[PDB]
Structure 1
Amino acid sequence: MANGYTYEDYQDTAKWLLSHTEQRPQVAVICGSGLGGLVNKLTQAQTFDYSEIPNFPESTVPGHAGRLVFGILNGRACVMMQGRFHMYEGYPFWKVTFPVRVFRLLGVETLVVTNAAGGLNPNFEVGDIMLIRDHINLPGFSGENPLRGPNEERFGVRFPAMSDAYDRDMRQKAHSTWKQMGEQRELQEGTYVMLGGPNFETVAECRLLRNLGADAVGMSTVPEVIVARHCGLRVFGFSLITNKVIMDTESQGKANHEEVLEAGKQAAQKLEQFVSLLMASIPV
């Protein structure tokens, strides 16, 4: 069955949030695996567990708290998803992307998406931050898309373009901000490739993904960007490179979830600082 949410379901949820907080966010942030710490910088924060918000799904993955937090971050009013949804949990893309449309109805204009990703580009090192300049939607190639089914004209057009999904102006700002931080390592930039999961990749799959032109691999984000662009939200996002993908059969180890979470904590002070500074000029 295609999207089971009607336009009214989104507004009902939006009305409920508006009726339970005085906060009116302009920016929305989605926190990935081991990135839930970004919420700690919010002032005047109000938290809502996903389970208490009508129509909201629930995050079942370790490293995803499952809480919507409103607050002020470096002067800008924003709402953060401390934990997100993935298709490997059993969620159809229309459930995975529910919050994005609700955000649009709350008056939000900018969406910031983050995630933990495996590094495909050889020049990447664990701990690197990669600005997502583009993506490759593998599930979309087969028809698995959050927009499949009747189009809701109240959100956007039937055939939205994706060539300009990641805002160019925001990416320039990200680079200027990084230089101001005095970081020794350069801010990376590249293409993110999404696949279903939940298992980690084989050596053969990784070589293929790299040869397709991808720099980092992950199991989320893309469906949210698609829905976000469909409804006209400005999108900006980045991947925290938590591990280097195994490219040789002499497997000197293998990817594991705790290592990615561990990496998130490791890069906590850096990402939070970066996101906090980025708030200045979103624009508005």
Structure 2
Amino acid sequence: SVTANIENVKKVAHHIQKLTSIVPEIGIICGSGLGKLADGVKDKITIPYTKIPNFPQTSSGNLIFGTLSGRKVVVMQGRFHMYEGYSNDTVALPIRVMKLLGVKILMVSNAAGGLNRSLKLGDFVILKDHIYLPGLGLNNILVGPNQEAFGTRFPALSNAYDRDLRKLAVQVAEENGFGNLVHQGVYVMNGGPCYETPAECTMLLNMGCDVVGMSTIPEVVIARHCGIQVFAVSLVTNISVLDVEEEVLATGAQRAELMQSWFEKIIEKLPKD
């Protein structure tokens, strides 16, 4: 792992800038099986991680540059999860690279378990807040010397999930007839990689959590630290079992396609400087 300090992050950024002339305004991270939720990318340039010195490596991932709905984007195909053993610096670096490349808004998707009992398989839950269990317990991604070039020692997490972006996302869903699928709620991070027990799920639900997953929050924290606005959404891929105690099942990719359309239509309506 290389330290995600300004000098290391600049070297990686400068290197990418030799490989593409596209200056992204929007960063997109697609979650576990949510790829292509960003690949109507027009006039694209594809940069494999292996091509970028000091950029983290997947256990084949790509950085994809291009235009979506008239706007310049960079899409991370392949994310870094704390349960895999990646360091704080490894996970922070891509987001800080995004900042140096010009990203102003980060759009994140993930798959999550539905804790809230009103949730259905296939629902979208826009994150309006989070509970960073690892961070409260001394594994916050910002532990260590503060990189001052990027942000302040004690970032506030007020309006972490930009309310104006959430409003827009909801309006876009409604306008395109899938508003009934969209909720807003609190995402809690389980460091993982075990799925949550019923007692764990009950505790988390009672803590005020709506969905649970193993990712996203660390990226959000780094984004907010360096002043990137954040939009994040969970796809509810399963309903959490709350108490201890064999059919033909379809597992299609329609929701993935829907989410892709959703992100494209949001980007279409984002403000542009």
- TM normalised by structure 1 equals 0.91
Task: Indicate yes or no: 2:113 matched with 1:130.
Answer: no
Say whether residues 1:185 and 2:180 are aligned partners.
yes
Q: Secondary structure at the match of 2:244?
A: coil
How far apart in 1 are the matches of 2:195 and 2:34?
20
Task: Give the counterpart of 1:151 among 142, 146, 154.
Answer: 146
Kept in 2: contact 1:27–1:111 (CA 8 A): yes
Q: Equivalents in 2 of 1:38, 1:184: separation in Å?
A: 18
Number of the residue aligned with 1:202:
197
1:53 equivalenced with 2:52 (yes/no): yes
State the alpha-carbon separation in 1 of the partners of residues 47 and 175 from structure 2. 34
Inter-CA distance 273–36: structure 2 relative to 1 (3 Å threshold): same
User: Does residue 268 of structure 1 match 2:268?
Assistant: no
Residue 24 of structure 1 corresponds to 23
**Secondary structure of the corresponding residue to residue 196 of structure 1:** coil
Q: Deviations over 1:54-91 (max 9, x none)?
A: 1111233xxxx611111111111100011200011111
Partner AA of 1:211 in structure 2: N
The percent of aligned pairs where both chains have the same amino acid is 46
Provide the rounded CA distance (Å) in 2 between the counterparts of 1:125 and 1:93: 33
User: Helix, strand or coil for the counterpart of 2:7?
Assistant: helix
SS at match of 1:143: helix
Q: Which deviations, in whole Å up to 9, do the C-alpha atoms of 1:7-41 show, x marking residues without a partner?
A: 11100010011111121110000111011112321
**109, 112, 117: which one aligns with 2:107:** 112
* 2: CA distance, partners of 1:167 / 1:239: 15
Establish whether residue 7 from structure 1 lines up as the match of residue 2 from structure 2: no
Aligned partners of 1:93, 1:151: CA distance in 2, in Å?
A: 12
Deviation at 1:127, TM superposition (A): 0.7
Letter in 1 for 2:144: G
Deviation of the 1:183 alpha carbon = 2.0
Deviations 1:221-248 (A, max 9, x none): 0011111001011111100110001112
Q: In the alignment, is the contact (CA less than 8 A) between 2:4 and 2:92 conserved in 1?
A: no
Q: Match of 1:244?
A: 239
8 Å contact 2:4–2:96 — kept in the other structure? Answer: no
Amino acid at match of 1:202: T
**Cα distance in 2, alignment partners of residues 141 and 55 from structure 1:** 29
Match of 1:282 in 2: 270
Task: Give the Cα–Cα distance (whole angstroms) in 2 for the partners of residues 281 and 154 of structure 1.
Answer: 31
SS at match of 2:36: helix
Q: Return the alpha-carbon distance in structure 1 between the equivalents of residues 194 and 16 of structure 2.
A: 35
The structural deviation recorded for 1:124 is 0.6
CA drift at 1:184: 6.2
Counterpart of 1:42, as a letter, is: V
Contact (CA 8 Å) 1:128, 1:188: kept in 2 or not?
A: yes
Consecutive unaligned residues in structure 1, runs of 5 or more: 254-258
Equivalent-residue separation in structure 2 for 1:165 and 1:16 (angstroms): 30
Determine if contact 1:39/1:69 at 8 Å carries over to the other structure.
no
CA contact (8 A) 1:31 1:114 kept: yes
Whether contact under 8 Å (2:122, 2:237) holds in the other structure is: yes
Amino acid at match of 1:4: T
Tell me the CA shift for residue 6 of structure 1.
2.8
Preserved CA contact (<8 Å) 1:110 1:282: no
1:190 deviates by 0.2
Q: Secondary structure at the match of 1:236?
A: strand
TM-score relative to the length of structure 2: 0.94
User: Size of the alignment, in residue pairs?
Assistant: 271
Runs of at least 5 residues in structure 2 that lack an aligned partner in the other structure: none
**In structure 1, C-alpha distance between the alignment counterparts of 2:78 and 2:158, rounded to whole Å:** 27
1:32-43 aligned at under 5 Å gives the runs 32-43=31-42
2-structure distance, mates of 1:227, 1:5: 11
SS at structure 2 position matched to 1:172: helix
Q: Judge conservation of contact 2:173–2:179 (CA < 8 Å) in 1.
A: no
